[PDB]
Amino acid sequence: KARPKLYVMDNGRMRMDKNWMIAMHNPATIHNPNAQTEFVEFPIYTVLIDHPEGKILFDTSCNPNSMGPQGRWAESTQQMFPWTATEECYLHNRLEQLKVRPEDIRYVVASHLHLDHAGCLEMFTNATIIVHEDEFNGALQCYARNQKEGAYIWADIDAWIKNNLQWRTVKRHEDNILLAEGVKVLNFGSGHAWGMLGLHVELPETGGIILASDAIYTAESYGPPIKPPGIIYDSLGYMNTVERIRRIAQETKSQVWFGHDAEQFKKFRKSTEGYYE
Amino acid sequence: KARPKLYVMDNGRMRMDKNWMIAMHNPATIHNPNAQTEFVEFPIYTVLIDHPEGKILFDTSCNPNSMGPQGRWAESTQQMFPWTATEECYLHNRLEQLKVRPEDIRYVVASHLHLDHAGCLEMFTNATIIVHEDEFNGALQCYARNQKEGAYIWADIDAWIKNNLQWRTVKRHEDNILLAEGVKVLNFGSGHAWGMLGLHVELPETGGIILASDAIYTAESYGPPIKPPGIIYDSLGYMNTVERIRRIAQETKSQVWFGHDAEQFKKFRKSTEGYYE
Ligand SMILES: CCCC(=O)N[C@H]1CCOC1=O
Numbered sequence: 001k002a003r004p005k006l007y008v009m010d011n012g013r014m015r016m017d018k019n020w021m022i023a024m025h026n027p028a029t030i031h032n033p034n035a036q037t038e039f040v041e042f043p044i045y046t047v048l049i050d051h052p053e054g055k056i057l058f059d060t061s062c063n064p065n066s067m068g069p070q071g072r073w074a075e076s077t078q079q080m081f082p083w084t085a086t087e088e089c090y091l092h093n094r095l096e097q098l099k100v101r102p103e104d105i106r107y108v109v110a111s112h113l114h115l116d117h118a119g120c121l122e123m124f125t126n127a128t129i130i131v132h133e134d135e136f137n138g139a140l141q142c143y144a145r146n147q148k149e150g151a152y153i154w155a156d157i158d159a160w161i162k163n164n165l166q167w168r169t170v171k172r173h174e175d176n177i178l179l180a181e182g183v184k185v186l187n188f189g190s191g192h193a194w195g196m197l198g199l200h201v202e203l204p205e206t207g208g209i210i211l212a213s214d215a216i217y218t219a220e221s222y223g224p225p226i227k228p229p230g231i232i233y234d235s236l237g238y239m240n241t242v243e244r245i246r247r248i249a250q251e252t253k254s255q256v257w258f259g260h261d262a263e264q265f266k267k268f269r270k271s272t273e274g275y276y277e
Numbered sequence: 278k279a280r281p282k283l284y285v286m287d288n289g290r291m292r293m294d295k296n297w298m299i300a301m302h303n304p305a306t307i308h309n310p311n312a313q314t315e316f317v318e319f320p321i322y323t324v325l326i327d328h329p330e331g332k333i334l335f336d337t338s339c340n341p342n343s344m345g346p347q348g349r350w351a352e353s354t355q356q357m358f359p360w361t362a363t364e365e366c367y368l369h370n371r372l373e374q375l376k377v378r379p380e381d382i383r384y385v386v387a388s389h390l391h392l393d394h395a396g397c398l399e400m401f402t403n404a405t406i407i408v409h410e411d412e413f414n415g416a417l418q419c420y421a422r423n424q425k426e427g428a429y430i431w432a433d434i435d436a437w438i439k440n441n442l443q444w445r446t447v448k449r450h451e452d453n454i455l456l457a458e459g460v461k462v463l464n465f466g467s468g469h470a471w472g473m474l475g476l477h478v479e480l481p482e483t484g485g486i487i488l489a490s491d492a493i494y495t496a497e498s499y500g501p502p503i504k505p506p507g508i509i510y511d512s513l514g515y516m517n518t519v520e521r522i523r524r525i526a527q528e529t530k531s532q533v534w535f536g537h538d539a540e541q542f543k544k545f546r547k548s549t550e551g552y553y554e
Pocket residue numbers: 014016020081114115116151214231260
C-alpha cells in the first residue's frame with residue numbers, strides 16, 4: 001500500500017533584487033527615469049519523503065558555512081543574495097529533529113546545483129545523488145575554471161568531490177524516473193539553469209504534489225500569464241517547462257509547490273508541526 | 278566589379294530603461310536594496326545600399342505617426358520607449374535628401390518587426406520585403422489577437438496589409454541569401470526576437486561589414502564577455518548568434534555594426550556627410 005510521510009523543512013530566508021525573480025517588474029519610464037527596484041525576502045526550504053523504500057531528500061538548502069567573513073560565498077554573492085538562518089534552520093538540525101541522520105538518506109534529488117539548493121549535498125555520503133547531467137557538467141566546469149563568484153559555490157563543489165559523493169546523472173533525453181512507489185523524478189531539462197529536476201509525489205491522503213523548485217519561483221511567475229525571472233539560461237526551455245508543469249498539474253489534479261513563494265510557504269505545514277500523508 | 282554606395286541614415290533617438298539593454302546591469306545589494314536604474318538614450322538608424330543591381334534598404338526605423346496623443350504607439354509604449362526625431366530624421370525625408378523615392382527600393386530587409394525597425398515598411402509597395410518567417414508569423418499573431426501594447430505595433434501591421442506589401446519570408450532552416458554581388462542576408466534565427474535577419478556587405482574599398490541590428494545592441498553587449506538584454510525571446514539562440522557574428526567577423530575581417538550603440542554611431546559617416554564604398 002505504501003504510506004509515506006512528506007516533511008517541509010524551513011531552512012531560513014534569502015533576499016535579492018526583485019528583478020532576479022520577476023524580469024523588468026518595474027521598468028523606468030519618462031516620468032520615472034530612475035525607477036527603483038526592491039529587495040524582497042523569500043524562503044529556502046527542502047522536502048524529506050520518509051518512504052518505506054527509503055528516505056528521499058529533495059534539495060539541501062545552503063551550507064551552514066556560507067555567510068560571514070570566513071564564509072564559502074564570495075562577498076559579492078553575500079551582498080546580492082544574503083542568507084539569514086537561525087541554527088535550528090540548518091538542514092542537519094532540521095533532520096535531527098526528525099531523528100534522521102544524513103546517513104539514513106537513500107536518495108538526494110538535486111533540483112539544480114545553485115548555492116541555495118546544493119549547499120549541504122556533501123553530508124549525504126551514504127546516498128545516491130540524483131542530478132541532471134547538464135547541471136552537473138555545468139557546475140564541474142565552474143569548479144575547473146576556478147570561478148569564485150556566481151551561483152555555483154566553488155567550496156561546495158570542492159567538498160562534494162572530497163567527500164566522494166555517489167552520483168546518478170539524469171541524461172538530457174532520459175524519461176522520468178520512478179524512484180519509489182508514488183515518487184517520480186521529473187526531467188525538466190534546461191530553463192532556469194542548465195538542468196532542472198522536479199518531483200511528482202502521489203500521497204494516499206493528500207494526493208498529487210509537484211515540486212517545481214526554481215522551475216517556478218512564485219505564483220506570480222506561474223500566472224498565467226508567465227512572468228519569467230531576471231536571468232535565465234534557456235528562456236524557451238523555461239517557458240516550455242512552466243506550461244509542462246501546468247499541464248501535468250491539470251492532468252493529475254496535483255498541487256504545484258513553487259521554489260521561493262513566501263505566501264505559499266506560510267501556508268505549508270512545516271516539520272515542526274507535522275507532515276503530509 | 279559592382280561599386281555600390283552604402284549610406285547610414287539617422288532616424289532619431291530613443292530612450293528606455295538600461296535594464297532592457299543590459300540585463301541586471303546594477304543589481305540591488307544589502308547596502309543598496311532600492312538600487313536605481315537609468316534612462317539611457319541611443320540612436321535609431323537605417324542603412325541604404327545603392328547597388329547597381331538595385332537599391333537595398335536594411336530596417337525602416339519608426340513610423341512618423343508613432344508618438345503623440347493621436348499616435349500609433351500605445352501610451353505605455355510611448356512612456357517606456359519614447360522616440361524623439363526632427364522632420365529631417367523621418368526615413369522618407371532621409372531618402373528624399375538622397376533623391377531616393379520609396380518606389381525606387383527593390384529590396385527591404387527587416388532585421389525584425391519591432392516598432393523601431395519596421396515602422397515604415399508600408400512605404401515600400403514596389404519592393405520585396407525580406408523577413409524571417411518566424412518573426413512575420415509572430416507579428417501577424419499579435420495583430421490577429423488585437424495586442425495593442427508591446428513592441429509590435431498593431432497600426433503598423435494593419436498598414437502593411439492594407440498597402441499590399443510583397444513578402445519573401447526566410448525559412449527557419451534556410452541558408453544565407455545572396456541578395457546581390459557582395460550583399461548577403463544572414464539568417465540568425467531566434468534570439469532577441471522570434472526571427473532575426475542580418476546583412477553581410479562586401480565593399481571594394483571599405484571591405485566587410487556585418488549589420489547585426491538588435492542581435493547585438495552595443496559594444497557592451499558584444500564584450501566579450503556577452504552581456505545579454507533584459508528581455509529575450511530565445512536566450513540560447515541569442516548567445517549562439519552573437520558568437521556566430523564574432524566568428525564571421527574574425528573569418529572575413531569584417532566590422533560589426535551594432536543596433537543601438539551611441540558611441541559607434543557617433544563615428545559613422547552619415548547620409549548628410551557621405552557614404553561607404
Ligand atoms: C539565476 C541566478 C540568481 C540566483 O541564483 N537566484 C537564487 C535565489 C533564489 O533562487 C535562486 O536560484
